[PDB]
Design a protein around this ligand. Structure first.
Ligand SMILES: N[C@@H](CC(=O)O)C(=O)O
Lengths: 142, 143
């Protein structure tokens, strides 16, 4: 709007948007899957459905919020360094989304053994690179 | 002077960011215990091994540690209305979390699953977001 940081809060602290909704979809999936183990009988097994559909929407919302950080970068400068931040986004997005198919489908054993914490971890690392090399940097250089 | 203040706000928004994010990590390792505690209605044993409950214990304590840094930074006066709010909203969202650590610690599956933790959580989000919005609206150095 005004220069950087006006366009950077709405941009990387709007990037903080995607990371909470992707983690949210993680909590919502393992509330869904625990109830799927209840299914052999009913007493509250019932919420499962609702949490899976509404797991799918937080990973949606993440996507769209990501779509502004994309449709907001005409930027680079930090360029291919934080291009990794943009690629591993896609990597976790993809994990979580398979975790929906799997669950959605009935495949619990890959649900449980698909190593989600790692695609996650990478993106922690990746946005966690960006803010460093935004913060100490466009100050030292502009 | 000038600078002083613009730099408390980033340490304070970072201590608050780390509390939130880390209290969220707690949610997910706790779920992962719960989830691996329901196994075939009642499986015989394990499911898997749930260290993950100890993991949730790690992450609660280290959420609560960046919030105890946050509570020892010099209070800007303007702000105090958002912080009172935040601390309410944080203390309760921490009790909520030790309570779920406990219901799991002692195998009370039906009471874990029963607690509205998403509600106390949501309460905190709208609080951190309102401190962050008030901050802009008060000290946004535009230009
Ligand atoms: N109290 C838990 C319920 C569940 O595990 O589904 C939550 O809201 O976090």
């Amino acid at each position: 709007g005004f220069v950087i940081s006006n366009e950077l809060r709405q941009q990387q602290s709007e990037l903080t948007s995607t990371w909470d909704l992707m983690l949210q979809t993680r909590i919502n999936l393992s509330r869904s899957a625990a109830r799927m183990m209840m299914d052999a009988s009913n007493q509250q097994s019932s919420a499962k459905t609702d949490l899976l559909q509404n797991a799918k929407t937080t990973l949606a919302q993440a996507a769209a919020h990501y779509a502004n950080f994309k449709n907001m970068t005409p930027l680079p400068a930090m360029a291919e360094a934080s291009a990794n931040v943009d690629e591993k986004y896609q990597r976790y997005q993809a994990a979580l989304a398979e975790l929906i198919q799997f669950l959605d489908n009935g495949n619990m054993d890959a649900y449980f053994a698909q190593p989600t914490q790692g695609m996650q971890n990478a993106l922690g690392e990746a946005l966690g690179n960006y803010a460093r090399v935004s913060e100490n940097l466009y100050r030292q250089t502009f």
